[PDB]
């Protein structure tokens, strides 16, 4: 992720993945201030504990199995899901199986709204935030 | 590798070259910072496998004073474009000559030593590491700020 | 060219020797110290049990240790109680009292010298050159007497575990000093005690609070000896693994040098060929 | 008169404010000690905790019912629930006793605690038990102490400490039980 | 190799077996097909192995694959020169390797 | 010894150096892994020191002058006089005075019955053992 | 310094120059066998550290600007004050602006008869050392 | 690096090798004070990767 | 010999630098410390003052 | 480094399963057992994978 980069479709992108991968690629680039010296070099403060197990879950949100790609409505509230804080209570270990969940359980209605008007709107949020709440996460 | 830290322009200031970086050319006051910059530039690179293989534990206090110095000058060096604002999100700063000077007189002296490293990264003057070192600490007060309720609104 | 990384990889490889090495020495030495911390551990329960524990007294003059290693391979060791000593020293003293800072170490004599020079009086090193013994630290605690404080103030860092070190600060209040009046509720909390000793509680309690200096910087020093070799034990897996990524990638430097340059001097070899045949 | 209560919480609010968050509070030995004097209990009926000491090893910790120190004032016996006593130790022969049985250390002095919880702590210095002592190399050594006068008092402070622990060491073993 | 390639592709596409092949030292196979190239006068490649290197072992290793009437699997002992992974005589042979079995003393 | 290798391996030795050679590489392998340790002045835990100096003793047991070769019986017992543990583990001041102290003291019939055999028997190292214990020096 | 050699060595430069930066090669190796050994701190005896101070106070001496080279009287000079006394309580931050004190606030007079002779003569060593204490360096 | 000392003439002290280094040519009194130059130099060149 | 078997242990380290025999190091530690036993008088009577 | 006796429960329990999972990679062949002994064995998929 830091060294990856697309500087031409960056101004190509959907709008709503683009509201919400803002955030996380900036939560991904300060888990990387906090890459192999959580304490294996040499300490722990335990006051970004917080991002050590955030960007663990945006990693974990960002793996995928082969042969199976996402639409990209579908992909923007996996995001939502994950860069707001819904699955925070979530184990690292069942994100995988969270978001799926996430995708399934939260009604299918709310895909074809992100996918015709292109953003995420005023409107949307409410109710993805209100679908959001209301998902039986695993574990926990 | 200056690029692989996140410092851009990624330009090496140990590699980049001038003739008129001379004294009787851009005045005194000019080039005796420039020397200044890669005096501790250059003693933060002799240290580098040091604090590799042994970690900055094991280096004097006086040159822990050189490391943490010279940690501030390269994210100070770092600096954000108005061509790089459409895929950085952030905007640009055209900084002055006598502001380059000043603030990096400041970081040689030891005026900024208070101020914390990432502080000086990808700011334009030194009156914005000021500025972004109370907004590094407002920010980490803003935990315990508010808790944030939506309420009343599906009717409206 | 080829070969300043051939013997630089020679460099980084026997120093990943020699800090595995390092690393096993410390930890035999933090097994064999373990025990004797555990012993030390008994008796500074009774004058806790006995004194109490007043760390943030009133006084006028106070004698601050701080025990450092003596050896500097620990890895942030002496450094984090020296941040430890200002941060309980710079507390206790805003009543402009006298404050001498004492080092056990010689670590802590090239570090507390620079940050207050102007309250060091005192630098003890080569402490743990054979093993710490408690009539060694009863002539260290001797010297403590000479100065005649209210209270003693003992920065180390406790052994935890071989992971964890807790910085702990311990207090000594001196008898009649302060140590007879910070007991007092409605009366005194030492007068329940019976004294069965030959002079009076002023001489019972001046050889009882040397006896409880003595003690506790005999715990102090061992306990902050075996954090010393549990800490380098530490470093000195962080200095592998940092020499053995540093030999990794340089290895991978050496073979792309390596094969650039049978690449060059075989392109070297047909242009001169070539002009030929 | 209580009014400076020092304390290890009370070291907390000066330290959150002078010295900086970004170091954890610094500890105390008496967050390590699960037994303190002046909370009562630990005898449950005829037995107390005794805790023997030198700084190079814990001697023991287990419950007695009787146990003899040799205070400066003479030995005295220590039963379940004795006055709290500091009582200031000469060289003589701590005696334990469980039960039956008996150990007999023999100690250089240091002091002995009984504290008002019922627990007891002893706090010698060095303790040898009297199978670890031969009396043939005791009175040679007296034989070179009490025959030497150097007029320095400092040196018969040191003799008068040879005297009697030499010769409480020596009716240590001759008055055998 | 070729020989030995054409005894396996018998049992392949005649008896219709599956059919294993062991390549003794797949290097020797690429080193002498470096050692042709340059007495033919061919101008060598990367380190000095032939320009022909990643089609005289693929001229090899397509031959070897699982057909309609038989199978041919093939276990390839690989030497690695200079314990070098990134030489051009690996490279090239773990691009057509679709398993690794290493004995370790 | 550690680059030196040998495809034909043991198959083609001596048997009364096949047995006693076989332990000899065995205790310098260990002796290698370790050898950082030799330079140190803290000692450890004793498993490690022995090796420590049994190893740096067996290095001493394979150095040889130029033009004189030993013949394959004299070496053997001098190995078997160093792996199974009749080392001068003595101060090592006394160096010239007992390294040929055993091929020159221990009878010369012992070499015969090796020769002959190719192999120490049991009916031999019995009498190996019985001749390596009553080694004289008597310079010291 | 290391590693720039001359093949004429003597005879082949000032006389003046010969006596005082003889002292100077000499005492600037010394320097630069203690510099890999300033990562510890240690600095035992004395020895290591007051090389320390006085090697870097020859390589500041040897620092000069461009496009103003100095008469070799005026250099014969300068290392004469670094060499031997007259600087050993000078900050090495302030080395630089120092010899402006040795070159303009000597007499120089000193200067004609050291071109004339071409050596240090022992009538001029006393004032050499006469008026190098005659000179306030504003080094505090 | 024997010059680079100080130490002239800056004979590698190891790497130089004769064929009169023989205790059969030059005898076995000149040839065990050689070997024993050697071995406590080449011992200075593995102690000093830990000295430092 | 003397310098591998132990004799001259008694010596300086840099005695040994830039001699010829070993009477030339035992004796060049004897100026050694002669002239370090120097630069112990700093008032007066040396050629600093400009009457003689 | 430290011992077998500092070993965590949830830490032993997967050095006693790797121990015997690391002898259950091992197998007696059929080509070897003309000089040693004991027989070869063929194990199927179905029993390799139940079996770990």
């Given at each position: 992720v830091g060294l990856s980069v697309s500087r031409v479709g960056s101004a190509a992108q959907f709008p709503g993945m683009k509201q919400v991968a803002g955030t996380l690629k900036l939560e991904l680039a300060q888990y990387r201030e906090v890459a192999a010296f959580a304490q294996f070099g040499?300490?722990?403060?335990?006051?970004?504990?917080?991002?050590?197990?955030?960007?663990?879950?945006?990693?974990?949100?960002?793996?995928?199995?082969?042969?199976?790609?996402?639409?990209?409505?579908?992909?923007?509230?996996?995001?939502?899901?994950?860069?707001?804080?819904?699955?925070?209570?979530?184990?690292?270990?069942?994100?995988?199986?969270?978001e799926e969940a996430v995708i399934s359980q939260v009604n299918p209605a709310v895909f074809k709204i992100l996918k015709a008007n292109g953003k995420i709107t005023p409107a949307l949020d409410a109710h993805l935030k209100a679908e959001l709440r209301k998902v039986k996460l695993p574990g926990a | 590798?200056?690029?692989?830290?996140?410092?851009?322009?990624?330009?090496?200031?140990?590699?980049?070259?001038?003739?008129?970086?001379?004294?009787?050319?851009?005045?005194?006051?000019?080039?005796?910072?420039?020397?200044?910059?890669?005096?501790?530039?250059?003693?933060?690179?002799?240290?580098?496998?040091?604090?590799?293989?042994?970690?900055?534990?094991?280096?004097?206090?006086?040159?822990?004073?050189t490391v943490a110095r010279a940690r501030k000058i390269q994210?100070?060096?770092?600096?954000?474009?108005?061509?790089?604002?459409?895929?950085?999100?952030?905007?640009?700063?055209?900084?002055?000559?006598?502001?380059?000077?000043?603030?990096?007189?400041?970081?040689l002296t030891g005026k900024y030593d208070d101020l914390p490293e990432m502080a000086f990264y990808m700011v334009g003057d030194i009156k914005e590491v000021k500025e972004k070192a109370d907004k590094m600490a407002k920010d980490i007060a803003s935990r315990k700020e508010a808790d944030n309720k939506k309420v009343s609104e599906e009717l409206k | 060219?080829?070969?300043?990384?051939?013997?630089?990889?020679?460099?980084?490889?026997?120093?990943?020797?020699?800090?595995?090495?390092?690393?096993?020495?410390?930890?035999?030495?933090?097994?064999?110290?373990?025990?004797?911390?555990?012993?030390?551990?008994?008796?500074?329960?009774?004058?806790?049990?006995?004194?109490?524990?007043?760390?943030?007294?009133?006084?006028?003059?106070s004698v601050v240790v701080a025990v450092?290693?003596?050896?500097?391979?620990?890895?942030?060791?002496?450094?984090?109680?020296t941040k430890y000593t200002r941060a309980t020293l710079?507390?206790?003293?805003?009543?402009?009292?006298?404050?001498?800072?004492?080092?056990?170490?010689?670590?802590?004599?090239?570090?507390?010298?620079?940050?207050?020079?102007?309250?060091?009086?005192?630098?003890?090193?080569?402490?743990?050159k054979?093993?710490?013994?408690?009539?060694?630290?009863?002539?260290?605690?001797?010297?403590?007497?000479?100065?005649?404080?209210?209270?003693?103030?003992?920065?180390?860092?406790?052994?935890?575990?071989?992971?964890?070190?807790?910085?702990?600060?311990?207090?000594?209040?001196?008898?009649?000093?302060?140590?007879?009046?910070?007991?007092?509720?409605?009366?005194?909390?030492?007068?329940?005690?019976?004294?069965?000793?030959?002079?009076?509680?002023?001489?019972?309690?001046?050889?009882?609070?040397?006896?409880?200096?003595?003690?506790?910087?005999?715990?102090?020093?061992?306990?902050?000896?075996?954090?010393?070799?549990?800490?380098?034990?530490?470093?000195?897996?962080?200095?592998?693994?940092?020499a053995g990524e540093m030999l990794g990638k340089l290895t991978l430097d050496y073979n792309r040098k390596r094969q650039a340059t049978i690449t060059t001097e075989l392109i070297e070899i047909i242009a001169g060929a070539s002009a030929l045949m | 008169e209580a009014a400076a209560p020092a304390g290890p919480k009370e070291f907390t609010e000066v330290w959150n404010k002078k010295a900086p968050s970004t170091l954890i509070v610094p500890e105390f030995p008496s967050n390590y000690t699960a037994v303190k004097a002046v909370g009562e209990?630990?005898?449950?009926?005829?037995?107390?905790?005794?805790?023997?000491?030198?700084?190079?090893?814990?001697?023991?910790?287990?419950?007695?019912?009787?146990?003899?120190l040799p205070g400066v004032d003479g030995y005295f016996g220590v039963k379940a629930s004795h006055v709290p006593t500091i009582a200031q130790l000469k060289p003589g022969v701590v005696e334990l006793h469980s039960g039956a049985e008996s150990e007999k250390f023999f100690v250089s002095g240091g002091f002995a605690f009984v504290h008002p919880n019922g627990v007891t702590d002893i706090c010698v210095l060095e303790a040898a038990t009297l199978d670890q002592v031969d009396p043939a190399a005791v009175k040679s050594a007296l034989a070179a102490a009490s025959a030497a006068q150097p007029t320095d008092e400092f040196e018969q402070a040191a003799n008068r400490a040879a005297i009697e622990l030499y010769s409480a060491l020596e009716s240590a073993v001759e008055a055998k039980a | 190799a070729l020989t030995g390639l054409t005894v396996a592709e018998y049992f392949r596409d005649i008896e219709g077996q599956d059919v294993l092949l062991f390549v003794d030292n797949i290097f020797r196979f690429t080193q002498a097909n470096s050692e042709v190239s340059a007495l033919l006068g061919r101008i060598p490649s990367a380190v000095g192995y032939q320009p022909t290197l990643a089609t005289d072992l693929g001229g090899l290793q397509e031959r070897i694959t699982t057909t309609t009437k038989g199978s041919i699997t093939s276990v390839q002992a690989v030497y690695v020169p200079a314990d070098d992974l990134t030489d051009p005589a690996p490279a090239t042979t773990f691009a057509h390797l679709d398993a690794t079995t290493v004995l370790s003393r």
């Open positions: 040499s300490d722990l403060d335990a006051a970004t504990q917080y991002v050590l197990e955030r960007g663990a879950r945006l990693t974990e949100m960002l793996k995928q199995k082969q042969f199976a790609p996402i639409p990209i409505e579908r992909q923007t509230v996996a995001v939502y899901a994950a860069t707001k804080g819904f699955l925070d209570k979530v184990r690292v270990q069942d994100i995988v199986a969270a | 590798s200056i690029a692989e830290l996140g410092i851009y322009p990624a330009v090496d200031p140990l590699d980049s070259t001038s003739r008129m970086l001379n004294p009787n050319v851009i005045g005194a006051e000019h080039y005796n910072v420039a020397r200044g910059v890669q005096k501790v530039l250059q003693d933060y690179k002799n240290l580098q496998d040091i604090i590799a293989i042994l970690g900055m534990d094991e280096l004097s206090e006086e040159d822990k004073l994210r100070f060096l770092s600096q954000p474009f108005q061509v790089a604002e459409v895929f950085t999100g952030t905007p640009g700063k055209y900084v002055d000559l006598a502001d380059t000077i000043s603030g990096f007189q400041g970081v | 060219s080829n070969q300043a990384v051939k013997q630089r990889i020679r460099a980084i490889k026997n120093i990943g020797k020699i800090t595995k090495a390092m690393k096993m020495v410390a930890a035999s030495k933090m097994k064999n110290a373990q025990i004797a911390v555990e012993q030390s551990r008994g008796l500074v329960d009774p004058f806790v049990r006995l004194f109490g524990d007043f760390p943030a007294v009133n006084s006028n003059k450092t290693s003596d050896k500097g391979l620990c890895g942030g060791l002496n450094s984090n109680i710079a507390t206790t003293e805003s009543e402009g009292k006298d404050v001498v800072v004492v080092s056990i170490g010689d670590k802590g004599r090239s570090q507390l010298t620079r940050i207050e020079s102007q309250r060091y009086q005192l630098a003890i090193a080569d402490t743990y054979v093993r710490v013994t408690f009539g060694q630290a009863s002539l260290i605690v001797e010297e403590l007497i000479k100065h005649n404080p209210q209270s003693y103030q003992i920065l180390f860092n406790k052994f935890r575990s071989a992971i964890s070190f807790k910085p702990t600060v311990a207090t000594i209040l001196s008898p009649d000093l302060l140590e007879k009046q910070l007991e007092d509720v409605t009366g005194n909390s030492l007068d329940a005690y019976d004294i069965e000793a030959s002079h009076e509680r002023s001489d019972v309690l001046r050889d009882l609070t040397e006896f409880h200096l003595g003690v506790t910087l005999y715990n102090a020093m061992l306990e902050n000896n075996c954090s010393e070799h549990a800490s380098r034990m530490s470093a000195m897996e962080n200095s592998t693994k940092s | 209990g630990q005898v449950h009926g005829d037995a107390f905790p005794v805790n023997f000491y030198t700084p190079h090893s814990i001697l023991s910790q287990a419950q007695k019912d009787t146990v003899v | -």
